[PDB]
Amino acid sequence: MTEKEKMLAEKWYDANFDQYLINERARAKDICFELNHTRPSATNKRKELIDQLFQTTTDNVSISIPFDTDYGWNVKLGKNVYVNTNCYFMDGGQITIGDNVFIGPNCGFYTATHPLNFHHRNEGFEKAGPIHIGSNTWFGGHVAVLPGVTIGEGSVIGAGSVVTKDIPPHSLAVGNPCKVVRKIDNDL
Amino acid sequence: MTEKEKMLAEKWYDANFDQYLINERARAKDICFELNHTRPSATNKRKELIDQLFQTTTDNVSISIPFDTDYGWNVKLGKNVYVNTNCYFMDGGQITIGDNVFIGPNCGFYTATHPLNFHHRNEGFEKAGPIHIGSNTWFGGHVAVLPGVTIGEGSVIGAGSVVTKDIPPHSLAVGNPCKVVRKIDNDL
Amino acid sequence: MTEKEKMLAEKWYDANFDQYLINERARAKDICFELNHTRPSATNKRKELIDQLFQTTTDNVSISIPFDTDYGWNVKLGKNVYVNTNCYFMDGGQITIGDNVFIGPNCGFYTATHPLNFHHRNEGFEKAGPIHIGSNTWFGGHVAVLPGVTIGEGSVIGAGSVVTKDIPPHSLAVGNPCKVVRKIDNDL
Numbered sequence: 001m002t003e004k005e006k007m008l009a010e011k012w013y014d015a016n017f018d019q020y021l022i023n024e025r026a027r028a029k030d031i032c033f034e035l036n037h038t039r040p041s042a043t044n045k046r047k048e049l050i051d052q053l054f055q056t057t058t059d060n061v062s063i064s065i066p067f068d069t070d071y072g073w074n075v076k077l078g079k080n081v082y083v084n085t086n087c088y089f090m091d092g093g094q095i096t097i098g099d100n101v102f103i104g105p106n107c108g109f110y111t112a113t114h115p116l117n118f119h120h121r122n123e124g125f126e127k128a129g130p131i132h133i134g135s136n137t138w139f140g141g142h143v144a145v146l147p148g149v150t151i152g153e154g155s156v157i158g159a160g161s162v163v164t165k166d167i168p169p170h171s172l173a174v175g176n177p178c179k180v181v182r183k184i185d186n187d188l
Numbered sequence: 189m190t191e192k193e194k195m196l197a198e199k200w201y202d203a204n205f206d207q208y209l210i211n212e213r214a215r216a217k218d219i220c221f222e223l224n225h226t227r228p229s230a231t232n233k234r235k236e237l238i239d240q241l242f243q244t245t246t247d248n249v250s251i252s253i254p255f256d257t258d259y260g261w262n263v264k265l266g267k268n269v270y271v272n273t274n275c276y277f278m279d280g281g282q283i284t285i286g287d288n289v290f291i292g293p294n295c296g297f298y299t300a301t302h303p304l305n306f307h308h309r310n311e312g313f314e315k316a317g318p319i320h321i322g323s324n325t326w327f328g329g330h331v332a333v334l335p336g337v338t339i340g341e342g343s344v345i346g347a348g349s350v351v352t353k354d355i356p357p358h359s360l361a362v363g364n365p366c367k368v369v370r371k372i373d374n375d376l
Numbered sequence: 377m378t379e380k381e382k383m384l385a386e387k388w389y390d391a392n393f394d395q396y397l398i399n400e401r402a403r404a405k406d407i408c409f410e411l412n413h414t415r416p417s418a419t420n421k422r423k424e425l426i427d428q429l430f431q432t433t434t435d436n437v438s439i440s441i442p443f444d445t446d447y448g449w450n451v452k453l454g455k456n457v458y459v460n461t462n463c464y465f466m467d468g469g470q471i472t473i474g475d476n477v478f479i480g481p482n483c484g485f486y487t488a489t490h491p492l493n494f495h496h497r498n499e500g501f502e503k504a505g506p507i508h509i510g511s512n513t514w515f516g517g518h519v520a521v522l523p524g525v526t527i528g529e530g531s532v533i534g535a536g537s538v539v540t541k542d543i544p545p546h547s548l549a550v551g552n553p554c555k556v557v558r559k560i561d562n563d564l
């Protein structure tokens with residue numbers, strides 16, 4: 001397998017020294033830079049950049065600057081997704097975001113693990129753990145979501161949370177580590 | 189009431205689809221953008237932008253870039269307020285900052301709540317909870333202050349704190365959630 | 377002593393009103409601004425700026441934008457140091473970083489303490505507590521490292537950690553406050 005295929009199959013891959021992945025990260029980063037230096041009221045320019053970054057035709061995806069991602073094409077987005085300032089979608093592992101998602105400022109969605117053993121880590125290896133973000137969710141600011149985590153549909157993550165484990169749907173969860181506090185009444 | 193008046197009166201308001209608030213947020217964001225792209229040594233330009241953003245004549249308010257706010261005019265500032273890099277004053281609810289305030293880097297002052305019910309939330313409703321920051325205070329970096337929180341005068345908030353409840357004056361408080369650790373001797 | 381010499385000797389110094397330190401912070405902040413506004417693929421320009429900022433000839437030090445530091449020359453770097461987006465090396469106290477160091481996004485390395493007494497603090501005084509970062513270390517994103525803290529070689533700091541005390545070598549440590557969870561097998 002290529003190191004890309006490895007990455008996408010949840011296997012250890014050489015994130016650092018693989019030329020194809022290096023170049024793909026460089027593509028995303030230069031688009032992020034342009035976007036981060038595009039005036040917020042330049043609506044069409046920003047939409048075009050966002051669509052180029054994510055390699056998709058977004059439907060009411062609003063990204064406040066600055067924004068960062070590793071690949072861009074490995075973030076799959078629903079409609080009506082509001083991302084406030086200073087978020088980072090580190091998407092070596094796929095980041096799936098549903099519809100009607102409110103993301104607070106300074107949130108990081110982190111799919112990259114490195115080996116704990118420094119000898120393996122220094123050789124460039126990573127393993128990507130996909131993140132799935134349910135539809136109809138809200139994240140407060142300053143949240144980190146760690147590799148492999150799924151947040152169920154209808155759930156609310158409190159500001160400052162570090163989400164180390166999956167959160168069931170219809171749940172209010174807060175803290176470091178993030179723990180479910182109570183169920184949310186999502187009735188019509 | 190207009191949605192603005194609702195916002196300012198602590199009532200549920202349509203933050204997302206109200207044109208007047210949309211345009212007011214767009215005003216602030218374009219000023220922030222200009223300020224964030226103004227060389228740090230361009231003293232006068234930065235002061236003029238800051239005064240335009242906050243709609244006031246500031247006295248020794250120093251804002252390190254980047255900075256963000258939603259309205260700008262809903263942040264009321266004392267003199268001698270030092271705001272380090274990457275702070276966000278999300279001021280739908282008023283944010284009152286006293287004199288001689290030191291704000292560390294990456295601090296978020298968050299006044300916005302959304303409904304927990306995703307049906308109400310997806311309709312664009314928010315409720316703003318004012319933040320009051322006492323005079324003679326110090327915030328470490330990476331702090332988040334949540335809606336409705338008052339930090340008393342003379343108090344110190346430790347780096348990484350998530351401040352969910354009011355902090356009494358003359359207090360050292362740290363943690364997630366932030367809790368008072370001890371009293372501070374602020375004697376002359 | 378000059379206030380610089382005081383700063384570097386772990387004594388209370390006037391950080392705010394000393395002209396020489398003010399001008400040194402202005403040098404670093406204008407280099408950061410240029411760097412933060414240099415296209416990520418402008419490899420040689422970014423290296424020249426990084427070497428100017430740190431006043432050294434770096435060996436495979438890669439800094440993702442944006443980046444911030446107070447002095448630049450008070451950060452001493454090994455080789456193979458990877459710094460992801462939105463870090464702040466607040467280096468009034470020396471920040472020593474070893475070889476083969478992976479630093480996650482939105483990490484703050486904070487050497488500045490202010491007096492707790494608001495009277496002394498408002499007079500501009502600080503005391504700098506050096507940070508030492510071991511070789512062969514990995515920091516997840518959203519980590520704050522507080523003044524005086526040493527992280528031993530071969531150690532891993534989990535995302536969201538607030539590191540208030542020294543962490544021994546060969547350790548996995550996480551949390552707010554950060555606590556050692558287990559030893560890491562770093563064997564060849």
Ligand SMILES: CC(C)(COP(=O)(O)OP(=O)(O)OC[C@H]1O[C@@H](n2cnc3c(N)ncnc32)[C@H](O)[C@@H]1OP(=O)(O)O)[C@@H](O)C(=O)NCCC(=O)NCCS
Pocket residue numbers: 104105139140141156157158159160161174175278298299300301302334335350352353364365
């Ligand atoms: C969780 C949240 C939604 C508030 O929920 P809440 O249940 O009304 O808050 P409560 O008063 O019930 O707090 C319940 C307990 O949980 C704690 N708590 C609430 N939010 C917390 C958080 N984010 N982190 C840690 N603890 C938290 C409170 O300290 C409280 O402690 P107690 O056991 O002494 O009562 C809060 O994070 C919030 O407002 N988040 C969004 C803020 C924000 O980021 N806005 C910007 C994005 S729009």
Ligand SMILES: CC(C)(COP(=O)(O)OP(=O)(O)OC[C@H]1O[C@@H](n2cnc3c(N)ncnc32)[C@H](O)[C@@H]1OP(=O)(O)O)[C@@H](O)C(=O)NCCC(=O)NCCS
Pocket residue numbers: 292293327328329345346347348349362363364369466486487488489490522523538540541552553
């Ligand atoms: C709170 C602070 C001032 C340290 O204060 P301190 O007087 O050293 O407090 P202590 O170390 O006596 O605190 C006692 C306990 O609180 C804990 N603690 C201290 N700061 C903490 C924080 N920020 N978060 C969580 N726990 C903290 C310590 O781990 C200590 O644990 P113990 O039970 O093992 O003793 C620290 O947050 C700080 O320096 N903040 C500013 C650093 C910074 O952000 N600088 C950049 C902006 S200038």
Ligand SMILES: CC(C)(COP(=O)(O)OP(=O)(O)OC[C@H]1O[C@@H](n2cnc3c(N)ncnc32)[C@H](O)[C@@H]1OP(=O)(O)O)[C@@H](O)C(=O)NCCC(=O)NCCS
Pocket residue numbers: 090110111112113114146147162164165176177480481515516517532533534535536537550551557
């Ligand atoms: C700790 C970390 C490094 C991985 O370690 P890990 O082996 O999953 O941790 P463990 O499972 O041994 O730890 C056991 C406990 O620690 C908790 N934990 C793990 N990471 C944590 C974190 N960052 N903060 C708080 N708690 C954490 C778990 O909830 C678990 O609880 P339990 O034992 O009660 O179930 C995690 O932060 C991580 O994935 N870090 C990198 C993520 C990142 O930032 N990537 C971007 C930069 S590449």
